[PDB]
Design an enzyme around this catalytic site. Structure first.
Site, short mmCIF file in Angstrom:
data_model
loop_
_atom_site.label_atom_id
_atom_site.label_comp_id
_atom_site.label_asym_id
_atom_site.label_seq_id
_atom_site.Cartn_x
_atom_site.Cartn_y
_atom_site.Cartn_z
CB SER A 197 3.17 -2.29 -3.49
OG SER A 197 3.00 -1.95 -2.14
CB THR A 236 -0.94 0.03 1.20
OG1 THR A 236 -0.18 -0.01 2.41
CG2 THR A 236 -1.87 -1.18 1.17
CB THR A 237 3.64 2.16 -2.23
OG1 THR A 237 4.36 0.98 -1.88
CG2 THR A 237 4.60 3.30 -2.40
#
EC number: 3.4.25.1
Lengths: 203, 225, 225, 225, 203, 203, 225, 225, 203
Positions: F169, F1-2
């Site tokens: 991600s 979840t960048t």
């Protein structure tokens, strides 16, 4: 957190020390552990600092209110019973304190109250971590026929013997003397130093 | 209109008026500042001889550093003085000391304003004056059945409101030693209450800034009488 | 009809009218914007000499960046000003700053509308004007015993409502330096209150945008008097 | 009977009538649909020159896709418009969008019906018209001091209710471009309010379906005036 | 989270640093830990960031309200007693904070408050994880006869000695000086850099 | 979840990615993590999906209500303080979120809020599981004198370097650019693909 | 005015007056201090022969160290005496002993003041006198349907209020042995109640400081009769 | 005054009076002690022949060691007797036994005193007599619509109050065997109720100390009739 | 905390000792464990001191209220039932007590109540930590035909035999004798010492 309080013929002598430490690390070298809650009544707190100070403020305000609206001072057994009810209403979410109440109404009294609410009157009492050393000194030198000066010497000797073997106690010594004629009198620092010098102790 | 606190046809609260005429029927009392303090003298007219003279006290203490003498209905007086005592103790527990005496008169005045405001309750038919020193210095207040407060150097209350306030309006001096202050106060109490051709020994207390409270005894007031 | 807040035979709330005639019996006060701020001048008619002249204040602060002068019943005035103070502090805790002063006058006006609305309580018989700067700039408001608010450049309140508002209606200039602004305000206060053939030294405060609050002292107002 | 909401001897709620004559004493305002939207024009009669002309707004936004202009008592108007704002925000939180504007007028109408229904409170003496587009399309509503709603193509409210509604009854055309629509609306506002032999610059807003809200400025309305 | 505050003759010097880290991972290299809550009063927070900032807002609003409605500033012991009651009403669902309050009313005071509500006045105090290093420096160089410039040099020396051995502290140094004549004054960054350069330190 | 957000001279660039995974198993390859909550303000959520979306709806409604009834936009520090109070009132039954707030009122700001309520302003910030890789790229190539195009290239380079070493991600890259002149502008997919092709990356 | 506790046109609470005339219709009772204690003598007029003479008791005990004889409505008397009993027991639990009897009369007087104060309840139409020793010594009180208390050396209550208080006003001696004290009390009770040309055997209790409570029997009172 | 429990112009509770005239319209009943117990005889005038003669009972049991016969409004009678039943059961749960029957009459009398005291409720228009043995011995009580209780050796209630109490006043003997006691009771009931020139078979119960309760049957009462 | 209570022909003899200890450390050598709660009724508490004293005050006040408003004393079985209900309403947040109630109404009774509320009448009973030693002495020497002097000798012998083997008991011995003719009578200290000397015991 060494506290002590003894009775004599028409006098109450209560003495503490001053060091605040909750680690193996000394926070403050000068604290307050001896309070005045009425005209002829004192109280020494020992335990958790916050709960102790809250109990001090609650007792001072209520004693002052009673004195103002009744024009007589509250008796010492009534003070101990009131504080016992205040501690025992919350016995499952308790206060971590252990305190002494002493005063003069017609005869000198010293009450010893624990964290659940049991108050027992005794001649001399001592709370804290240096309390076995204080009870060891007072077991072998206390006499009922002692004078006020000899009592002041005795409590200084007891606390100065507890300061040598307990790592959590140290600093200067508060001494307060309660008498019917003179009221609550707290002895000056130079007089305490003169006592220590004439006895032969250090610090 | 004339039975519960609502507005007049022109801007008058009728019940709060009727409370003011209830406090005009009371016993007279006064007080004034002097050089470093403030005094409170109540008239005490001990009517019969069976009344325990010194046990009935209208100069009542709220704290060691605020006092109060009242006039009006005596029951509402006692209840309101007890509310003032516990409010002073609340401020002592919360902040550590009674820093302003104006706070103490304002909370009591808000308590009286509430029953001025709402229906289903009559106004407090009582008037009080507060006196004492704080961090600011000597203060002397007044209270009204609406909750109106005013700060004075010298004021009165009771049946001899207007005559005493006329004498105070003429003859008051601002900075004044304690002895001449209590003498001027007694002359004020005399000139009004000498219509029944008697005064009596009154009750009187005093503070000078720094010290605690001192109510006189029976013997000291008769020297100034 | 004439005793509790219900409707007339034709569209009039009788108690809220009677509150308006209660605030017509008060002490006069006014205020106006100038070039970069706003001023508030109350008349202060210190009647007796025993009143502690400078300690009674009708220009009271709600915050360092909103002030208020009131007129009407003085007890309801004090209670309402304290509600405004704690509401300003609520907005400071919640959002971080007092972004709009119009929010602060609207919450107080809703508080007055409630007791206009319900039975079992009389309306607040008090009128206030608010003044200060916000992010928008200088604002000057008014309040009504019904809770009606209006934004002005120059307004009045009290016994000299109509005469002062007539002089303001004739002689006001929009952008004006502070000295000539307080001079015009004092001439307005004069022309009405010079019917008892005296004015007195009034009380007056001011802000210019950027700075905090500044209430004058006793000596500065007499130069403009 | 004539003092609290109970029934007549023949089927009339007297307080709700008295609220209707309270909203007949207000300021006139109107609105009508045009080809792809709806407009709202309030009369704004800026009486004095000290009133901050453009800051007083009677066309107030409930959302970016519902607006409201009111008439009657202005305090109850402000409280009711704020209730409509927070109800629109409740529907935005719960469902995701304001799907029906009829739901928004019905919840506000239920709020007015409650104080029509119960004792111990007077009815809201205020009338509003709502306008905006939803998923259905352009809608124009009305509200009543009893909580009665009706859907219109063109309606009015205020002191010039009947004269404007007579002109709208004669001269309204259903599908109409925005320019001729605001011209017809201004002629309607004229024919009634030209009894004080003046109109003024009025305030007017508009939406066309697809776009957000657009309130005119001071300069644009005078071209159609 | 190194904080320090010392007293002098009619001056209070309070200094912190600025690094926010709750991992072995540095989130922010520039935070705020030194606040102003009254005209002549400051406060340093150290502990949990959220609870700290909530206590800061609650104290600033209530001090401002008291100042406005009484026209005098609140005394420092009253500030510490109020904050002690606020922390001790919730002692079982506590706040994870440890803070200092310093100011001037008639004499310079520094109070040290823990997470349960015990406030003890002392001459100098230090909270955080670099507090033993700060107490080690201040034990051997502090003197009561020092001037204001020597105090500013001393707190910079103490924090710069704590920054070398504690991994959780670092960054620039905030310094604020409280005086009765000049009020709350916070020293500029170029002046702090000039102090560091003339002493002989880095960063 | 960048997530990432940087500031420039009068511009804020905020970029996320799109993959929803709470297992070792990829549920959805196309999610929403970048929202618009005001005219000149955005917000990136990262953490638990449900609590994140509830906070998004609560902030959007309250910002819109404030804008409508005050006719001015809410300042960014007020937005962060409001959201900090909302998170810290429930700190014992907490939200599992970690979010960023960026916008323009008079100067570009980026705030970083954790799950307890501590909001710290910084120049650039990054939350998620790829945040150490993003902080590694931004430590060595960020400069304050960069232009808007170079910033858009930099955040794409940072997220594309975090996508190679973090398993949680991946997917397409949302990029939004906030400017005082043009407002909240979200860049099109073909323009992002053109950026990736001219830099020399894949997917 | 004459139906619920509100103010008069001149400062009179009409219901509390009507309660005072309700307690003027009661049975007479009195009490006085003697050399080291205090006595309470009630008249007991056992009217019929079917009444269980000694089981009806108007001198009722609140504690082993406070007693009470009442006059007025007998039901409100019983309820108020039971409230005084449980309040004395509350003070015994909280502090350990009944230190002041003045506290006990003041709490009961506050209970009567509340229903004097509020609407929706009538005042307690009952009057009581309290007697006993505390740490201070012998005390003798009185209570009023408003909640007014007064401390006496000798007082009365009931139908023979004024005649007994006249005899006490003439013939009371302060320090007096118990036998001559109860003789003086019986002469007081005689001079009033010998208008129906009979007295009866009355009921009488006594305390001397140090001892507990002692109510006489039927045989001992007839020696002093 | 005449509609809700407030004070008279002279000391009379009008509603509690009207309740006493409501219990003067009831059916007569009486009771008296004998040598080792107490009896209760109700008149039962079974008017029609469709009434289920023995199933209607006015002598109702509260417990095996307290019974009650009532007079007045029959519905309030039933509700109050059920309250007395559950209060007796409360004392049995808490302490173990019904030690005092005087406690049981006093709690019911307090219940009647409350609705004598408060507004928004009418007083209980009912009167009861209680009878039974306790640890003290045989007791016989009475109750009043105000809550007044009295202890008797022989009493009555109902329409034939005064005539029966006159016969009991003349002809009662204190220690009396059970047979002659019920004979004297029936002669008392006769002398009053023989004005409609009939008595009927009445209902009668008895206890002697040590035993439980015994209500007679139809056949046994006609031997004493 | 040794307590004992036996019955005879028209007499109840109840005896305790006096030592307060809650550690391996003796706090007080003189406490109160034998109380008077009515004219002809006593009660011995044993267990937790605070809860014990609260129950003592609650029983004394309620017995006095009942006596005043009924003019007869409360029976012993009613006292035990009332105290059983008071202990059993809070059986999940309990009291740590174990107490005895003895008195005379028409015949001598002794009730034994535990911490949950079960009251069982028996001839003789004993609570505390020395209760097995007391039950061992009373099993072999108790007789129903004993006189009042022999009973007083027996309880002194039992407690003095329990003091030798139990470390938590010791001190002087309270003895109270309840009789219908003489009421609650507590025997003097010199008479107890005379009993101990004529039997042949120590301390």
């Amino acid at each position: 957190t060494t506290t002590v309080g003894i009775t004599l013929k028409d006098a109450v002598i209560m003495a503490t020390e001053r060091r605040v430490t909750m680690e193996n690390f000394i926070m403050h070298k000068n604290g307050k552990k001896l309070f005045q809650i009425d005209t002829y009544t004192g109280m020494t707190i020992a335990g958790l600092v916050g709960d102790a100070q809250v109990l001090v403020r609650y007792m001072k305000a209520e004693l002052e209110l009673y004195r103002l609206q009744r024009r007589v001072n509250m008796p010492i057994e009534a003070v101990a019973t009131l504080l016992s009810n205040m501690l025992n209403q919350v016995k499952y979410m308790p206060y971590m304190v252990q305190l002494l109440v002493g005063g003069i109404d017609t005869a000198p009294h010293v009450f010893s109250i624990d964290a659940a609410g049991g108050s027992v009157e005794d001649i001399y009492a001592s709370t804290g971590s240096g309390s076995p050393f204080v009870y060891g000194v007072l077991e072998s030198q206390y006499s009922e026929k002692m004078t006020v000066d000899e009592g002041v010497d005795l409590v200084i000797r007891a606390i100065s013997a507890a300061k040598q073997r307990d790592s959590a106690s140290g600093g200067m010594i508060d001494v307060a003397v309660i008498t019917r004629k003179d009221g609550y009198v707290q002895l000056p620092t130079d007089q305490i130093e003169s006592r220590i010098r004439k006895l032969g102790l250090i610090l | 209109d004339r039975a519960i606190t609502v507005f007049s046809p022109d801007g008058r609260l009728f019940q709060v008026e009727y409370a003011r005429e209830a406090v005009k029927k009371g016993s007279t009392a006064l007080g004034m500042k002097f050089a470093n303090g403030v005094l409170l003298i109540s008239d005490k007219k001990v009517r019969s001889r069976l009344i325990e003279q010194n046990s009935i006290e209208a100069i009542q203490l709220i704290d060691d550093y605020v006092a109060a003498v009242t006039s009006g209905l005596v029951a509402d007086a006692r209840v309101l003085v007890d509310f003032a005592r516990i409010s002073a103790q609340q401020e002592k527990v919360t902040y550590g000391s009674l820093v302003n005496i104006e706070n103490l008169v304002k909370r009591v005045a808000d308590q009286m304003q509430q029953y001025t405001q709402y229906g289903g309750v009559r106004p407090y038919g009582v008037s009080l004056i507060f006196a004492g020193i704080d961090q600011i210095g000597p203060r002397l207040f007044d209270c009204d059945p609406a909750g109106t407060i005013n700060e004075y150097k010298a004021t009165a209350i009771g049946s001899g409101k207007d005559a005493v306030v006329s004498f105070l309006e003429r003859e008051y001096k601002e900075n004044l030693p304690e002895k001449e202050a209590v003498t001027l106060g007694i002359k004020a109490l005399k000139s009004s209450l000498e219509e029944g051709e008697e005064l009596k020994a009154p009750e009187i207390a005093s503070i000078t800034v720094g010290n605690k409270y001192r109510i006189y005894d029976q013997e000291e007031v008769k020297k100034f009488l």
